From a paper:
Additional structures of BpGCDH resulting from this effort were obtained by soaking apo BpGCDH crystals in drops containing our Fragments of Life (FOL) ligand collection prior to data collection. In three of the four ligand-bound complexes fragment molecules occupy the binding site for the terminal glutamate of the glutaryl-coenzyme A substrate. The crystallographic water coordinated to the Arg97 side chain in the apo structure of BpGCDH remains in place when FOL544 is bound, but is displaced by FOL239 and FOL6421. In all three of these cases the Tyr373 side chain is rotated approximately 90° from its position in both the apo BpGCDH structure and the human ternary complex. This new position appears to facilitate ligand binding by providing a parallel aromatic surface that aligns with the heteroaromatic rings of all three fragments. Despite the presence of 100 mM HEPES in the crystallization condition and the soaking drop, neither the apo structure nor the other fragment-bound crystals of BpGCDH showed electron density for this buffer component that was sufficient for modeling. This appears to be a pH-dependent effect as FOL6421 is the only acidic fragment in the set, it is present at high concentration during the soak and no structural differences are found to account for this case. In all four fragment-bound structures Thr376 and His377 are flipped out of the α-helix observed in the apo state, partially occupying the binding pocket for the adenosine moiety of FAD. This perturbation results in a new orientation of the catalytic YEG motif. Thus, the binding of small metabolite-like ligands induces a conformation in apo crystals of BpGCDH that partially fills the FAD-binding site with protein residues.
Glutaryl-CoA dehydrogenase (GCDH) is an acyl-CoA dehydro­genase (ACDH) which catalyzes an intermediate step in the metabolic breakdown of lysine and tryptophan. Unlike other flavoproteins within this family, GCDH (EC 1.3.99.7) performs α,β-dehydrogenation as well as decarboxylation of its sub­strate glutaryl-CoA to yield the product crotonyl-CoA. Transfer of electrons from the glutaryl-CoA precursor to the electron-transfer flavoprotein is mediated by the cofactor flavin adenine dinucleotide (FAD) in both prokaryotic and eukaryotic electron-transport chains. Like other ACDHs, GCDH from B. pseudomallei (BpGCDH) exists as a homotetramer with tetrahedral symmetry and possesses an overall fold similar to that of the human enzyme.
Residue numbers in the entry:
A (entry chain C): 4 to 142, 148 to 352, 356 to 394
B (entry chain D): 3 to 141, 149 to 186, 191 to 393
C (entry chain B): 4 to 141, 150 to 187, 191 to 350, 358 to 393
D (entry chain A): 3 to 141, 150 to 188, 190 to 353, 356 to 393
Write the structure that this text describes.
């Protein structure tokens, strides 16, 4: 048997050709269209809404959404593969993509009415309408509220750090509704142009600059009864979305790690020092072996998670394992690779690195997935 | 949703065939039943009960990949892995004894032996009636075979040989002019001696000694006819490494299980230790690395069964398993308070064992360098 | 001009003649009398109280205690250099010494009556009397005021020296409710000190319990001049200072053994010293060791001036012990075996004060005014 | 009754002479007064502010150890270190501009130049009226050929700090005579065949201007070749001096990152509790403090030894490597403590600078190998 250094366990062979064609398409697309924009799209934080129709055309948005509602009907593994190819170029692009697929199309599909499903999904799937997701507030114990009024509801509040909001057409806002006996979290579809709805940008981000982020500002915004999500109440709504998004990020972070690895490898092959090429140094070799190992193992982890999700056998806690691992290992590898590079084109690594610094702290600095896993091992929440 | 299994998050148990699961279960019943009760005294006094060979052999745990034709159990590589894991869960020293039998003695006889050699040695090695060892290392090989009427005369020495003082069968690598050839010798050969080595830091539960050859006669029929060069020895080392890749994860799991149960049992300001944020991160890391390590060795095993596994993959897995296992053992050690009291310090036994296992192939991080060359095309 | 790999910053040239003599004296004792014993003593966890008389003789017990009471009247830097030389052989021996000097002699001297100071210090200095320190419990140990003195019930655990001690500095609670120091003597009825055996590390030191069953202490054997936390804490702080030095002696041994091992080894074609991974590990041991020593030296100089706040001991004890453990592990992972001993000792040393990084929390508080 | 100083636990302040403390104070006032207000926008848009050199020289911050005879302040090595620490505390890019003037231009001329060269160049470099650069690294091809009048120079230098704004160029080229050896030449701005195009779009050290040196048959008179050095000792003497100051500077950067993370966690509240109330945050602050404090003792001691001449070059390898390595770790630790994406992100600037600082001397651990060789007597 021959050894494939770039794919030691032959992931390629563990994929259905079905899944493999999706990867190839995603790769062709991201390399063809996103890679030549990335460097200056990142450097100048340039707003860019192209991705959506481009990805929509070739069926890369909401990949697990059935054909019935305009989705491509792909499986969890294929969603994984797509995320990996986009983030191989940049995490900012992957993020915009995560929002559309996991944070908008998933809740609508999962908790929407048939009318909501048949109305919104097709336009999201093709990228005609761009979505955003309204949960996080400036600080469940959320402030944004919906008061019941003649017709439907009246929403007031703010959401912050919302990817896609300054270019969104469909807003999936989460807010509290006082029903009868207690106050529960509910989901709302708002459309752009609705009065009371602002979404100004956030500028000056240190990382994920290639993605556009903003606020969602709601000042007595009216939502008719037909635009509340009927089939969910409470945490289950927002959490289903975050679980799906994290699964994709678990694949996507390994794409960026691979990019850093391949660059570090090619660099030390091309450069010379005190006689030999840099690749001849044992310290360099160890670093390259550590990168290969963690990526190879990480990929088996996410592949297996996706297989389990398609079977319906994967509990939510497994996502914590892979998301945390993929992100933390990708950050370590991005740093390892940074520290191998001289000379202030290779510096796609510095970009990946600052992206991953943000990705690793996006869900906070208290290692929330460690805590989910610790409680799942012991039954005890850490306080 | 689906149920979360903290102890088997990716449900390894369900990626196994039922014969593989049966082998695992039998290996578990044996180790826990027969090795766990011996291990504390065996280690402390550096005793090995050679009856372990006959016991493991009874159950069909020796040379698991050797076909039934030659008296083996005819199992696949995943099963070999599962067995090493259950044995090492108890003690690396016991796993080492088995690693020698199966990978260092039965494998080369099977791959490189004549029909006569395979028929004579393998059934007895498989049942553990005959105990084997592997003579490669020497304190650039000076042990030499010379042609003499009706065979060969071997002179030289091998050092740090596991099983050697209790071996019935010896696979020795020696130069024959000028290639490396493998020879099968039997205890009682005039010229052959196997003095024991005592006072080990780790792997105290396995026995180690030398092989000393002073014109030891080997008849013609006992030279391994179908191999010459480094490939003979290296095929064996590669097989051994594969099972250690699984085994080290067994010991890792024990350390993790001990550490978890310890922090569950203990208190600190009335809060149980598991309330501690730092403890949770540590348990999460232990769980993550074992879970991923296991997916790695399983996939390698499946590839080796289908013949699609290059030898470099073995370097990835053995290095990772041994490396992460040692870090886990050290993580679990430093979580423990006190100084020896309670079998929570069974972590101390696993720890010293893994410190030997992680340096047995030398201080040079050999596998990082194999993998480095494999990536770059450059010997470093 | 000339580089000293074993002393890059020439600590030798930053020490007074006074201090260099004391160092080389503790070195000669340790290497001549302790090194030949340690391997068997560790193996069999064998007790040997003769070590107390041998150190007393050369004046290594209570090195900062005034000549007036039998101590050698040395300075804090000298106490450190001694700890480092003793632990260079074995942490167990250093621990026996830490107890005599910082947990027994320091408190009698610091908080004891003139009567107490004269009766006990002289014989502790010479090692004729052996002392132990009863603070840690399995606080519930207490002194009932009774006729003539006090009756102590309770139990102390993991007490170094206790099964060979003559003098016990025991800490109990008494109502007036506060923490007081008591002095007990071997033989007193209701006082036993059974041995603890089976240790994984520090096997060369003898540890035991102190079991008090209505043990009598006369009124003259309470420490008059301290109450509350400051009592035990004064002792711990001095012991921790010595350990900050000591741990670096063990680290140095590990580094020297690892270095010599790789000089002597051939692998593939060359020596192990040819390997860059090995050289990087060696560069890391040298760095951390050299920096740690500048830290403990400076701390010592500050303590001798009276400019040293107690928080600085937390910095150095944490760092020396943490780095020493790391270096013992790095050394171990280079060896294909006194290192293995130093390693298990330091694994105990590093968790002796708990597994919750108490010194990190002390320093976090000191930086922020906010308790964790 | 001794009080603890969290920000100076070993009272470094009290280990300085008055001399040295006054220098530190002046460097501190200048950097905080004049550099801090510029740094954010200068970093962002890669501002060239050449006026900084005159500002620095005015107070005696350029070429600290150069004697008064030639316009230098005649300070000791410890003072050089204190200056570097205070400048880098604001930004590594400003420290870099200073390192070049002091260690890479004034040191080579003072140490290896003729009397004529020293009196001509040093006074104007000390005041900052003339700005220097140091041309070693290439994209050694750079050749000086003996002609009538002096020397013709051809070649290119790359990544040369200050070069687009330099008045004085210290360029190292190879010359054959009697054999083929590294010599030092001094060129000046406006010399025909000398150009120095600026590099822009840097990831780190964006506050320092860098560029090229392109020599197309550039004429250097006889009087402008450095006459008292040949071979590697020339450049090496400069690099070593530069490293000593970087060893102090990097620790200033670490201190800023530490001070920002501390203030951040005191200012922030989470869960009705200051962030500083968390155990992990306190460990991180303790590690930052420990490593900074210990590093400072090292570079203090190294400077003292250098002032009395007892310091071998290898000690500079230890401290430079430590300071830069620990600074990066501390910078990364603080960065990871900050939750957000877009002033306490002053840490982001220090971080990207330090990532360039830690790779400037090679993709691999050049100093570790110096210390390895030094410990063992064996080369890698
Ligand atoms: C897709 C974006 C918003 N995102 C990111 S990130 O911005 O790509 O890092 N991390 C997430 C975790 C959970 C849900 C969404 C997340
Ligand atoms: C089985 C024993 C000898 N062994 C060991 S060990 O002693 O169990 O660690 N490591 C090995 C690597 C290759 C081949 C054999 C090995
Ligand atoms: C001297 C022994 C008991 N000891 C030790 S140890 O057992 O040598 O590690 N660590 C200590 C910390 C504080 C006080 C005493 C300590
Ligand atoms: C002063 C600049 C050029 N510099 C730097 S840096 O750019 O400030 O990191 N590192 C150096 C190492 C040796 C010599 C000079 C160095």
């Amino acid at each position: 048997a021959t050894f494939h250094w770039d794919d030691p366990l032959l992931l390629d062979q563990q994929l259905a050709d079905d899944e493999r064609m999706v990867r190839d398409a995603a790769h062709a697309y991201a390399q063809g269209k996103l890679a030549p924009r990335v460097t200056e799209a990142f450097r100048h934080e340039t707003t860019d809404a192209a991705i959506f129709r481009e990805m929509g055309e070739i069926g890369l948005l909401g990949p697990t959404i059935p054909e019935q509602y305009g989705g491509p009907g792909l499986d969890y593994v294929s969603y994984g593969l797509i995320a990996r190819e986009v983030e191989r170029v940049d995490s900012g692009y992957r993020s915009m993509m995560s929002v559309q697929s996991s944070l908008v199309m998933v809740p609508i599909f999962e908790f929407g009415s048939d009318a909501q499903k048949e109305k919104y999904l097709p336009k999201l799937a093709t990228g005609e309408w761009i979505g955003c997701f309204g949960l996080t507030e400036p600080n469940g114990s959320m402030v944004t509220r919906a008061r019941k009024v003649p017709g439907g509801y009246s929403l007031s509040g703010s959401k912050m750090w919302i990817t896609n909001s300054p270019i969104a057409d469909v807003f999936v806002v989460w807010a509290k509704l006082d029903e009868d006996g207690r106050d529960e979290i509910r989901g709302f579809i708002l459309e752009k142009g609705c009065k009371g709805l602002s979404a100004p940008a956030i500028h000056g981000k240190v990382g994920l600059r290639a993605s556009i982020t903003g606020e969602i500002v709601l000042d007595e915004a009216f939502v008719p009864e037909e635009n509340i999500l009927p089939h969910v109440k409470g945490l289950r709504g927002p959490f289903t979305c975050l679980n799906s998004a994290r699964y994709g990020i678990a694949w996507g972070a390994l794409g960026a790690a691979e990019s850093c690895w391949h660059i570090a490898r090619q660099y030390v092959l091309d450069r010379k020092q005190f006689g030999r090429p840099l690749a001849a140094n044992q310290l360099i070799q160890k670093k390259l072996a550590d990168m290969q190992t963690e990526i190879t193992l990480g990929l088996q982890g996410v592949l297996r998670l996706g297989r389990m999700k398609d079977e319906g056998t994967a509990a939510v806690e497994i996502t914590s394992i892979m998301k945390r691992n993929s992100c933390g290992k990708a950050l370590d590898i991005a740093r390892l690779a940074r520290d191998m590079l001289g000379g202030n084109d290779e510096f796609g690594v510095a970009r990946h690195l600052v992206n991953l610094e943000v990705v690793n702290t996006y869900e906070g600095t208290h290692d929330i997935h460690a805590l989910i896993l610790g409680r799942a091992q012991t039954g005890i929440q850490a306080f």
